[PDB]
Amino acid sequence: LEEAPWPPPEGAFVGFVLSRKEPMWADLLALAAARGGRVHRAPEPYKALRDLKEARGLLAKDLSVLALREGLGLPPGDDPMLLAYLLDPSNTTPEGVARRYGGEWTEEAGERAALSERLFANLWGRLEGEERLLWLYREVERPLSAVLAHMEATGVRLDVAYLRALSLEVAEEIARLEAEVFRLAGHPFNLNSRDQLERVLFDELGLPAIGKTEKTGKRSTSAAVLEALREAHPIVEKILQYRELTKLKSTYIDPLPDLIHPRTGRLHTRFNQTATATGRLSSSDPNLQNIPVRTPLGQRIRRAFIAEEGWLLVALDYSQKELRVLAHLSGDENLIRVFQEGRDIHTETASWMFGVPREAVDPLMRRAAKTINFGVLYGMSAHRLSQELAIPYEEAQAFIERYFQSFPKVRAWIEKTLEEGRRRGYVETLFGRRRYVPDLEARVKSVREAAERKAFNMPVQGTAADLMKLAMVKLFPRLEEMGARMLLQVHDELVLEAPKERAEAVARLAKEVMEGVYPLAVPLEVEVGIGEDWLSAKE
DNA sequence: GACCACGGCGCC
DNA sequence: AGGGCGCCGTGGTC
Numbered sequence A: 001l002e003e004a005p006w007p008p009p010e011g012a013f014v015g016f017v018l019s020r021k022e023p024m025w026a027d028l029l030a031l032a033a034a035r036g037g038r039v040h041r042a043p044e045p046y047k048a049l050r051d052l053k054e055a056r057g058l059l060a061k062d063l064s065v066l067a068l069r070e071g072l073g074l075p076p077g078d079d080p081m082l083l084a085y086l087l088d089p090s091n092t093t094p095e096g097v098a099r100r101y102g103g104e105w106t107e108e109a110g111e112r113a114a115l116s117e118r119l120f121a122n123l124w125g126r127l128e129g130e131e132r133l134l135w136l137y138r139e140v141e142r143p144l145s146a147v148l149a150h151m152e153a154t155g156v157r158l159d160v161a162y163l164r165a166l167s168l169e170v171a172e173e174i175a176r177l178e179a180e181v182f183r184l185a186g187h188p189f190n191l192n193s194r195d196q197l198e199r200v201l202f203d204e205l206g207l208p209a210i211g212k213t214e215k216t217g218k219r220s221t222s223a224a225v226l227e228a229l230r231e232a233h234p235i236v237e238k239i240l241q242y243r244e245l246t247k248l249k250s251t252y253i254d255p256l257p258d259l260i261h262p263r264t265g266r267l268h269t270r271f272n273q274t275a276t277a278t279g280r281l282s283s284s285d286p287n288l289q290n291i292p293v294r295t296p297l298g299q300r301i302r303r304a305f306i307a308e309e310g311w312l313l314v315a316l317d318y319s320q321k322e323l324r325v326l327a328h329l330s331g332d333e334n335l336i337r338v339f340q341e342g343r344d345i346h347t348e349t350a351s352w353m354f355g356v357p358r359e360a361v362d363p364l365m366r367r368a369a370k371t372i373n374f375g376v377l378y379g380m381s382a383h384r385l386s387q388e389l390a391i392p393y394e395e396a397q398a399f400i401e402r403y404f405q406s407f408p409k410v411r412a413w414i415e416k417t418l419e420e421g422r423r424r425g426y427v428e429t430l431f432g433r434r435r436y437v438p439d440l441e442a443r444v445k446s447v448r449e450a451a452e453r454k455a456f457n458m459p460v461q462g463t464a465a466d467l468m469k470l471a472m473v474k475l476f477p478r479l480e481e482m483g484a485r486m487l488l489q490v491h492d493e494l495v496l497e498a499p500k501e502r503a504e505a506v507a508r509l510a511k512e513v514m515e516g517v518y519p520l521a522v523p524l525e526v527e528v529g530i531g532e533d534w535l536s537a538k539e
Numbered sequence B: 001g002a003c004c005a006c007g008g009c010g011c012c
Numbered sequence C: 001a002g003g004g005c006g007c008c009g010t011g012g013t014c
């Protein structure tokens, strides 16, 4: 390319280099743009950001987040990564996409700008004629990247002092548990080491091994194994409690307060848009899509996510999301009718596994039922179900037969999905998002059947993801108009922040947008709560 | 210091 | 014979 002075013309492709992957934390080391057979390199990258009207190129959203951090409204536009990801969701990195579609991802801005330009041309070519993939790009992914940039740059408020205090209390309890485990083992060892624990449990103590690990075939010490051994030795329950507390302390309580951004005073995640096989988003650095919620200590941690003074959090969560999507994809009349009588399958399953009335099923009971319903739906074995329910194998067998007898059109849909997947080599969501699943014709049964479960899950999980993304795209401009913020997405949940005087109106509006995003054969229902913290906003 | 594979486990 | 993720500490290499 011909070396040309900064700035570039309108519509140029940008290339940029960051000191680290997280745009809220990165130093912008270099900035370039490419167009019309020219490459333009910015003398000073921060100042040069001001000259761009749009971030167009590889990883556009990341540059847009950095610009928002610097007080500049630089929206992301075309990004070859999104084109590649729609062609084949195994396209998740610029390294791989470059090598596959006509270049090399280097560490130089100018080369990255030229690359973005060439990859865009090639990928746009590959997508001509792919009308539904093009619809997803224009109507969902490209616009969504702008929404995600705003969410990332906004961040969420955290009660840091609360978590610091919590760390000291939890440390004391961890010490109590550790001391008691060591007393029982007859000696201290590294309780965090599953290898040392394995020897203590199965060699030193007399305990029976229950299962083996996948890659190396060691005797497993997983929670499932431990729970099966709960009454074989007092040391077991102590280890399970130690595991719960250290998991929560090491993963959330200790690291999160250290991640508060000095300028915003808030916590900023990344919403990765080309990271999953199904079309879901993911969240990283830190992951805010797996904040605890199940145990009492977990709930204590979730309470640390709070609204700005004068604002409230609004949490919206699709009810029985994937079951409703299944109803639409399959057309089962019984399952559809369930959602037209306002029945709740999670509640009904919970009343059965706990042997209590439906009105006796509490939130945490109902939640327990989710792993069971989704577990059985996507191919859980009777043996496994037997083990998690602690019921005779024959009992698990009958629950799984009855589960599918009730909704007969579902198995039909599964078989149709698998057949089409074998023939075309990919499966697809309601909107035509594809996942290639080559192992559908593997000659090894375990491999083939794993592939099958992946394959028939994807249209369901991925259609739900398509709907959530579309809803975010529709909802965001309404929130901006009302002076509200979108903070987090958690697969089928959104967390918003609204001024107190407007929170009720925001909640009502957001609920309507989400419920009416794309009318299906069954209603999509949304549960919404408002609160000063994330936990109380879902209570 | 970075990076890896693994087991393990937090959420959806 | 649940699916989809990302992060932790260990054990380890470079």
Ligand SMILES: Nc1ccn([C@H]2CC[C@@H](COP(=O)(O)OP(=O)(O)OP(=O)(O)O)O2)c(=O)n1
Pocket (backbone or CB within 6 Å): A317, A318, A319, A320, A321, A322, A323, A346, A370, A371, A374, A375, A491, A492, B012, C003
């Ligand atoms: N153990 C789980 C939990 C969730 N999911 C998927 C399917 C549902 C989707 C959304 O998660 P939830 O909100 O927790 O499930 P829900 O059916 O929508 O339950 P709820 O009515 O309480 O929101 O994520 C799953 O595959 N396996």
Ligand SMILES: [Mg+2]
Pocket (backbone or CB within 6 Å): A317, A318, A490, A492, A493, B012
């Ligand atoms: Mg949810």
Ligand SMILES: [Mn+2]
Pocket (backbone or CB within 6 Å): A073, A075, A146, A150
């Ligand atoms: Mn904007």
Ligand SMILES: [Mn+2]
Pocket (backbone or CB within 6 Å): A168, A169, A172
């Ligand atoms: Mn104390």
Ligand SMILES: [Mn+2]
Pocket (backbone or CB within 6 Å): A317, A318, A319, A320, A321, A492
């Ligand atoms: Mn839900």
Ligand SMILES: [Mn+2]
Pocket (backbone or CB within 6 Å): B006
């Ligand atoms: Mn692993």
Ligand SMILES: [Mn+2]
Pocket (backbone or CB within 6 Å): C003
């Ligand atoms: Mn799983």
